[PDB]
């Protein structure tokens, strides 16, 4: 069904490991949860109160409040099961498993897109600000000087008073991982012609952060494929919704820019993170000849893939939102990593 992302050097077996942070070593007692596993499940246990809300007030679901209880209950129970016996529920657990257990408790209860009214108002407001945000970047005559603006916009699209305000108030540089200089150097040579991008959140993150960036690439001579979730996971943008967003934005041009090279792909993903060894077949066909891959969101670029090796130039970009992630990286909360690996 799923196939390995084409830019992952083969063989991927015993080499590519999606997860970025290990919570257990082979030498650890298999019947006792490790301090780390224990502390990481807390990141997921502390996600419930906020998930049981977007679910209980989901008016599209009949008797949502009761069902949200079944959610909090079943998910907390599973989390306790793992702390007591890390081998059950498919453990040892990693970030991917914990995310999947959350989506499963919810879906089994009949949920498909519990983040609907949110994503709607998200794109709702973002759509009313695209021309303003785009015009600016264009007003920036220098290409590299401009590249930075868009790169900061990607980071601002994360947490977000306004998107533009948030764009000028990121944590000070050097950023946790700061490969921007090396990236800007190659960007000015403009040698990329096949970019693919694994997007994350709806609204400003996709509309004001990623799309203006994608538009600049097209304006410099590249094809761009945006890979989005097949199924709703948090406020993440799915391929279906992204097609609707661009359909509205687009002479089929994005504020004067031709989009014939703007392609949308269904990564086949259904989590806020992603395992690149297993994706849709469509995604790979479209990314079969890519020379610029990009995985956005703390999940897709840092929790997973941060150290993934690719056959072509690579860049993981996302804002750090977990204190635990900041700790593993030795960074600040809301730090921005810009990791670029040439060749």
Which residues line the annotated binding site for Mn(2+)?
A: 200-201, 236
Contact 238, 158 (CB under 8 A): no
Q: How far apart, in Å, are the Cα atoms of 130 and each of 120, 237, 250?
A: 15, 17, 12
β 223-228/262-266 pair status: parallel
User: What x/- string results for residues 286 through 325 when contact with Mg ion is judged by CB under 5 A?
Assistant: -----------x-x--------------------------
3-state secondary structure (DSSP) of residue 9: coil
Q: Which is nearer to Mg ion, 58 or 205 (CB)?
A: 205
Residues of span 137-156 touching Mg ion by CB under 5 A = none
Token look-up 């600000």 returns 129
Tell me: does residue 275 bind Mg ion (CB under 5 A).
no
Q: Which of 94, 122, 216, 236 binds Mg ion (CB under 5 A)?
A: 236
Minimal distance, residue 202 CB to Mg ion, in Å: 8
Token look-up 């650890």 returns 28
Tell me, rounded to whole angstroms, the distance of Cα 57 from its chain centroid: 25
Q: Which is nearer to Mg ion, 232 or 272 (CB)?
A: 272
**Nearest Cα residue to 84 out of 30, 27, 28, 21:** 30
Q: Which is nearer to Mg ion, 37 or 236 (CB)?
A: 236
Q: Which is nearer to Mg ion, 18 or 222 (CB)?
A: 18
CA distance 178 to 158: 17
CA distance 295 to 322: 18
CA distance 15 to 205: 31
User: What x/- string results for residues 194 through 223 when contact with Mg ion is judged by CB under 5 A?
Assistant: ------xx----------------------
User: What x/- string results for residues 104 through 123 when contact with Mg ion is judged by CB under 5 A?
Assistant: --------------------
Minimal distance, residue 273 CB to Mg ion, in Å: 6
- The DSSP annotation for 20-80 comes to SS----TTS-TTS--HHHHHHHHHHHTTHHHHHHHHHT-TTSTTHHHHHHHHHHHHHHHHH
Minimal distance, residue 300 CB to Mg ion, in Å: 8
> How many residues form the binding site for Mg ion (CB under 5 A)?
7
Residues of span 162-201 touching Mg ion by CB under 5 A = 200-201
Q: Which is nearer to Mg ion, 40 or 175 (CB)?
A: 40
- Binding segment (CB under 5 A) for Mg ion, from list 29-37, 76-84, 234-242, 310-318: 234-242
Minimal distance, residue 206 CB to Mg ion, in Å: 10
Residues within the interface to Mg ion (CB under 5 A): 200-201, 234, 236, 272, 297, 299
């Amino acid at each position: 069904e799923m196939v390995p992302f084409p830019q992952l050097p083969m063989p991927i077996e015993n080499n590519y490991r999606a997860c970025t942070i290990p919570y257990r070593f082979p030498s650890d007692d298999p019947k006792k949860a490790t301090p780390n596993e224990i502390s990481w499940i807390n990141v997921f246990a502390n996600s419930i109160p906020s998930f049981k809300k977007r679910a209980e007030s989901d008016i599209t679901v009949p008797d949502a409040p009761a069902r949200a209880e079944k959610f909090a209950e079943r998910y907390a129970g599973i989390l306790e099961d793992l702390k007591k016996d890390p081998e059950s529920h498919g453990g040892p657990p990693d970030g991917i498993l914990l995310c999947r257990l959350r989506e499963q408790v919810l879906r089994e209860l009949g949920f498909r897109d519990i983040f609907k009214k949110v994503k709607d108002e998200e794109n709702a407001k973002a759509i009313s600000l695209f021309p303003q945000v785009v015009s600016l970047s264009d007003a920036i005559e220098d290409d590299g000087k401009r590249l930075e603006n868009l790169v900061r916009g990607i980071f601002a699209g994360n947490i977000f008073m306004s998107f533009l305000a948030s764009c000028q108030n990121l944590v000070p540089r050097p950023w946790v991982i700061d490969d921007l200089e090396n990236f800007q150097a190659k960007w000015i040579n403009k040698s990329w012609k096949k970019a693919v991008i694994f997007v994350d959140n709806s609204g400003a993150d996709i509309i004001l952060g990623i799309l203006p960036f994608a538009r600049e690439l097209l304006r410099r001579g590249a094809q761009v494929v945006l890979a989005a979730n097949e199924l709703p996971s948090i406020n993440d943008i799915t391929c279906t919704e992204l097609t609707e967003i661009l359909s509205q934005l687009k002479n089929g041009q994005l504020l004067g820019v031709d989009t014939s090279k703007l392609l949308i792909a269904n990564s086949g993903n259904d989590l806020p993170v992603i395992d690149l060894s297993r994706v849709s077949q469509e995604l790979a066909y479209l990314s079969s000849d890519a020379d610029l891959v990009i995985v956005e969101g703390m999940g897709r670029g840092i929790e997973t893939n941060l150290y993934a090796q690719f056959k072509c130039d690579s860049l993981k970009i996302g804002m750090v939102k977990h204190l635990e992630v900041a700790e593993f990286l030795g960074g600040r909360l809301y730090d921005c990593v810009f990791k670029f690996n040439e060749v």
